[PDB]
């Protein structure tokens, strides 16, 4: 019996790049041209792209012409493509043909979240409100669960640049970034300078200053 | 080339002759394949070239037509066979579909009994509040869930589900959850759950007052 | 001068297969012999594989051998990869030579969070307290946030299938599955019986029972 | 085939000449390329068969060696070139990397000043608790943070971010993030943060009760 497999999907977000590839069982591609379907949640089926024998050719669909791209290889018998929110489909690897000159794969699940951009959360990292005597404190500014980098953070807009460490950023188990942006200054300074911290992100065009501050 | 399918959702009983019309925009000869797909399955070749029976799938079934018409044919339905069926216009080297057919098993417009559920306080507790949307056993299969949390109109934070045609009844049943945290959930009083469908004569609204 | 460029790279989960593909600027593959290469956490390289001339060979490091698989486009000039936790690294698409007979790309991310599977959590869509006059009511188990497919929903363990609809599992925008498991029965014995959902969960080896009684 | 280098951390100043061993298990004639990374930059070639010298590449540098032994010299440091550095037995169809050598500014031994911020509520608010441990300032780069929330030992559920070498001190700062719902950060009182350190005689404990 022939068969044919999909591997590679998952969740993407919106602009984004994921890549499938197709396994095959029993036959060789070589002599075929190979074709992508997607099927949409209309229940609609599309047809996404084909390559001929000898990769004489490839045909994309219009709505795709252009961010995607097939590939096979007719030695180890695999198809690939590269890569919306009208993207998100099931997508069968597929085989034209006969008998005499037909066969698919069970499809792979392909989803792309709208958000291209989202902003980043500011919260303060307080030093403390007992403070005094005359001591170091650290005090600065959490920014959390944006996408994607980067993330510039300032202290007072230009001014305050010593002492200061800005982490690098870390990829959370969900896939969305977080920084901590930290500054040395006097124990003794916590409650005249006062601290504001700039988290300018250029790509969701969003700026959020946040006062930083003993609770 | 562009092919339309009709009808979009045919109904008819066990043991039916039925059919389905496929067109394409210009003259495509003989080449156009038949294709059934049972839900998150492959799909299943069945008619190539108009009219030629693809080894392996039984008598009942039948094509023709050339030029720009076409006609897909079963005879003698079985449960085996409700499922959905494409159309294709296969070339050398693209191709093209139809919008679909899906074959359901007819009964009466049967309306949504409509419940709501809130959100318990063992997940109240946890940071989020799951409020949920059911649609017990109705026919045909298209109907509309619009959330109103406070009386405004939500787009887009909630997600559904549709049950097959119950092995017993032919209805349908949609299930259409609403999610929210915790700290967007005890912001609003009144969450308003209001579906549309054939068999009510108006939009059917079903609330709860937080807490 | 010379360019190599990767994408395809995010979060995969244990045992997870993802596709990684090298597209190129400036030159030809087709003569090279292409190599992919990852940075593990302890700063160490690593090369994964390589991919020969005409493809006359394909070379696997051992850690790898056997989930993995490279394969190269020599007429649009792109290769390829094919898919644990010490997987989790940077990946590299390299070309092996010389100016006579060297260049890199900027590398991916590549990560593999540590769960193969997710028990999934049980809790009471409890009846409408509206209730009254011999009617119908609606009850359930909301079965939330479990991976992977499937989760069979069977009601007081084999004795009330009627009226019962085990809905479609949906994919949240987190990538964790969702539900609902519901059954229509009188309002009138809402009461004496009790109602009991049993959510096996065949893949992380999961079975929780939930008591679906009042508010 | 195994490539070990030697040393792991190499310490040195500007102007410095300093060198690295890389050794093979096995008789590697002169096949063997050295490479310079900076983080998250591609790596770049240096130097191929034991000792010629890649074209684009200033002449402060240096390889040798053949059979299982060889040797790279770096020839008065500079800024550019504080960095990691790899070697690399590349055969016909596969290839093995030493575990690296990472050069750093070489400084004095200071220890972690130890700091700890707890999780605000402004987020305490939305069902997340955040809790922060900074080792502020410290050399060399080896220091290890283990949490400890009601004197339990946690593992897994924190998450590191270290500086490079600050421009000016040579010194290192540790960012160590603890994150829990907002529903298992209210089960517990004490939240303990435990740093191990070379210049430490002991290690350094920073906690809060909550609230």
């Known amino acids: 019996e022939v068969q044919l497999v999909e591997s590679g999907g998952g969740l993407v977000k919106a602009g984004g790049s994921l890549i499938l590839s197709c396994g095959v069982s029993?036959?060789?591609?070589?002599?075929?041209?190979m074709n992508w379907v997607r099927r949409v949640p209309g229940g609609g089926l599309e047809w996404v792209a084909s390559?001929?024998?000898?990769?004489?050719?490839?045909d994309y669909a219009d709505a795709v012409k252009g961010r995607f791209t097939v590939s096979r290889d007719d030695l180890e018998d695999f198809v690939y493509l590269q890569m919306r929110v009208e993207d998100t489909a099931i997508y069968y690897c597929?085989?034209?043909?006969?008998?005499?000159?037909?066969?698919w794969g069970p499809g792979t699940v392909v989803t792309v979240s709208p958000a291209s951009t989202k902003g980043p959360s500011v919260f303060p990292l307080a030093p403390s409100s007992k403070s005094t005597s005359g001591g170091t404190a650290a005090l600065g500014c959490l920014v959390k669960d944006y996408f994607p980098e980067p993330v510039t953070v300032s202290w007072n807009s230009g001014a305050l640049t010593s002492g200061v460490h800005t982490f690098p950023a870390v990829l959370q188990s969900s896939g969305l970034y977080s920084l901590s942006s930290v500054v040395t200054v006097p124990s003794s300074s916590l409650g005249t300078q006062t601290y504001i911290c700039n988290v300018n992100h250029k790509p969701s065009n969003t700026k959020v200053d946040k006062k930083v501050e003993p609770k | 080339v562009v092919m339309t399918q009709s009808p979009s959702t045919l109904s008819a009983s066990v043991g039916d002759t039925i059919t389905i019309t496929c067109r394409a925009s210009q003259s495509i000869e003989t080449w156009l394949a038949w294709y059934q797909q049972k839900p998150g399955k492959a799909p299943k070749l069945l008619i190539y070239?108009?009219?030629t029976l693809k080894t392996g799938v039984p008598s009942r079934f039948s094509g023709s037509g050339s030029g720009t018409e076409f006609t897909l044919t079963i005879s003698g339905l079985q449960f085996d066979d409700f499922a959905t069926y494409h159309c294709?216009?296969?070339?050398?080297?693209?191709?093209?579909f139809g919008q679909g057919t899906r074959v359901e098993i007819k009964r009466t417009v049967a309306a949504p009994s409509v419940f709501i559920f809130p959100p318990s306080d063992e997940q109240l507790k946890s940071g989020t509040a799951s409020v949920v949307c059911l649609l017990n056993n109705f026919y045909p299969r298209e109907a509309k869930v619009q959330w109103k949390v406070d009386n405004a109109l939500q787009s887009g934070n909630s997600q559904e589900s549709v049950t097959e045609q119950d092995s017993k009844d032919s209805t349908y049943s949609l299930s259409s959850t609403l999610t929210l945290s915790k700290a967007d959930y005890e912001k609003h009083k009144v969450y308003a759950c209001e579906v549309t469908h054939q068999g009510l004569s108006s939009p059917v609204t079903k609330s709860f007052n937080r807490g | 001068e010379v360019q190599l460029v990767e994408s395809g790279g995010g979060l995969v989960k244990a045992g997870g297969s993802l596709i990684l593909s090298c597209?190129?600027?400036?030159?030809?593959?087709?003569?090279?012999?292409?190599?992919?290469v990852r940075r593990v956490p302890g700063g160490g390289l690593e090369w994964?594989?390589?991919?020969?001339?005409?493809?006359?060979?394909?070379?696997?490091?051992d850690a790898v051998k056997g989930r993995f698989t490279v394969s190269r486009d020599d007429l649009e000039d792109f290769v390829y990869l094919q898919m644990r936790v010490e997987d989790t690294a940077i990946?590299?698409?390299?070309?092996?030579?010389?100016?006579?007979?060297?260049?890199?790309?900027?590398g991916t991310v590549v990560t593999v969070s540590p769960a193969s599977t997710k028990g999934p959590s049980v809790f009471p869509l409890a009846p409408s307290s509206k209730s009254t006059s011999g009617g119908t009511a609606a009850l359930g188990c909301l079965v939330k946030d479990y991976f992977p497919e499937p989760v069979t929903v069977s009601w007081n363990s084999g004795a009330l299938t009627s009226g019962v609809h085990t809905f479609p599992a949906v994919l949240q925008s987190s990538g964790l599955y969702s539900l609902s498991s519901v059954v229509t029965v009188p309002s009138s014995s809402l009461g004496t019986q009790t109602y009991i959902c049993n959510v096996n969960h065949k893949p992380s080896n999961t079975k929780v029972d939930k008591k679906v009684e009042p508010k | 085939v195994v490539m070990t280098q030697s040393p792991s951390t190499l310490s040195a100043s500007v102007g410095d000449t300093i060198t690295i061993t890389c050794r093979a298990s096995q008789s590697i004639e002169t096949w063997l390329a050295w490479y310079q990374q900076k983080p998250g930059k591609a790596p770049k070639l240096?130097?191929?068969?034991?000792?010629?010298?890649?074209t684009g590449v200033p002449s402060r540098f240096s390889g040798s060696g053949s059979g299982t032994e060889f040797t790279l010299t770096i020839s008065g440091l500079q800024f550019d070139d504080f960095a990691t550095?790899?070697?690399?037995?590349?055969?016909?169809?596969?290839?093995?990397?030493?575990?690296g050598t990472r050069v750093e500014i070489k400084r004095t031994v200071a220890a972690p000043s130890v700091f700890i911020f707890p999780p605000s509520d402004e987020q305490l608010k939305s069902g997340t608790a955040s809790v922060v441990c900074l080792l502020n300032n410290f050399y060399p780069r080896e220091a290890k943070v283990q949490w400890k929330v009601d004197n339990a030992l946690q593992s897994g559920n924190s998450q590191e971010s270290v500086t490079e070498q600050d421009s000016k001190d040579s010194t290192y700062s540790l960012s160590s993030t603890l994150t829990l719902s907002k529903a298992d950060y209210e089960k517990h009182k004490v939240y303990a943060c435990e740093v191990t350190h070379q210049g430490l005689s002991s290690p350094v404990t920073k906690s809060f009760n909550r609230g």
């Open positions: 597929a085989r034209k043909g006969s008998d005499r000159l037909d066969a």
């Open positions: 294709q216009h296969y070339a050398g080297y693209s191709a093209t």
């Open positions: 029993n036959f060789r591609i070589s002599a075929h041209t």
């Open positions: 390559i001929s024998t000898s990769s004489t050719y490839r």
């Open positions: 070239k108009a009219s």
